[PDB]
Amino acid sequence: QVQLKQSGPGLVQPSQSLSITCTVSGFSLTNYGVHWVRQSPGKGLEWLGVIWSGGNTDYNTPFTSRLSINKDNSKSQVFFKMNSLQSNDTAIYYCARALTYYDYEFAYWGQGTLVTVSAASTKGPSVFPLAPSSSGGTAALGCLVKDYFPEPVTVSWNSGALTSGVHTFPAVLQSSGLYSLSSVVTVPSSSLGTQTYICNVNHKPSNTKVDKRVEPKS
């Protein structure tokens, strides 16, 4: 199976440098070129550059001066680096592979790395329960994931086992400049005495991992 797995999301200060690692498997970097594409609110999808099988590189014109792509064939790693970051460089960065060695029809994508370009400092969130209260046999419950920077946090339930009826809402920016996010799930009210419910929260930029058990309040 062909896969591309990228390093985690990060905060970078203005004028500072960016570094992402793409690690591939199911093919060899000696046979395929790896492309870089970013996606931003302002500019949408932009192709940035490519490192070919033999090690040559092409950079999209506005990036020639502040972009370098490198790799280690034996380690199956591609190294993306961009200098002189400004605010509009905040985007999701992807690595990608084409169908054939020389082409640009991107059939395989990395999961994407969100890079936030900002002067602020990293902050890990607090996790608070949204406790079920005493809906025709259905109870709702959740977690409030509050006051973190930058994006993203991942949230899951019962270590990935519970997915049905889960809604994890988009994060919103509070006036404080810190993000906040809620995640809910509906379950049978009669399973509240039997099953445990835990939201698993991860804020990689601050290395904060929290498991919050959510229970009906006393």
Partner 1 sequence: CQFDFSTRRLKC
Partner 2 sequence: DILLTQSPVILSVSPGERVSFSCRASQSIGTNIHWYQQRTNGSPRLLIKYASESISGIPSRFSGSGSGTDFTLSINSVESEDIADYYCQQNNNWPTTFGAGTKLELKRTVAAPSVFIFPPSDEQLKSGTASVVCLLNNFYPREAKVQWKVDNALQSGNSQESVTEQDSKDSTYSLSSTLTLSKADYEKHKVYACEVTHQGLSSPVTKSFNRGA
Does 106 interact with partner 2 (rule: CB under 8 A)? yes
CA distance 140 to 185: 6
Tell me whether strands 113-117 and 10-12 are parallel, antiparallel or unpaired: parallel
| Shortest distance, position 14 Cβ to partner 2, whole Å | 26
Does 10 interact with partner 2 (rule: CB under 8 A)? no
Q: Tell me the DSSP string of 37-69.
A: EEEETTTEEEEEEEE-TTS-EEE-GGGTTTEEE
Considering only 44, 54, 160, 193, the residue that binds partner 1 (CB under 8 A) is 44
Structural element, H or E, at residue 36: strand 34-40
- Does residue 96 contact residue 22 with C-beta atoms inside 8 Å? no
- Quick note: the x/- pattern for partner 1 over 48-67, rule CB under 8 A, is --------------------
Residues that bind partner 1 (CB under 8 A): 39-42, 44, 92, 112, 114, 151-152, 170-171
**Residues that bind partner 2 in the complex, under the rule CB under 8 A:** 44-47, 60-61, 94, 99, 103-107, 109-112, 126, 128-131, 133, 135, 138, 140, 142, 144, 146, 167-172, 174, 180-182, 184, 186, 217
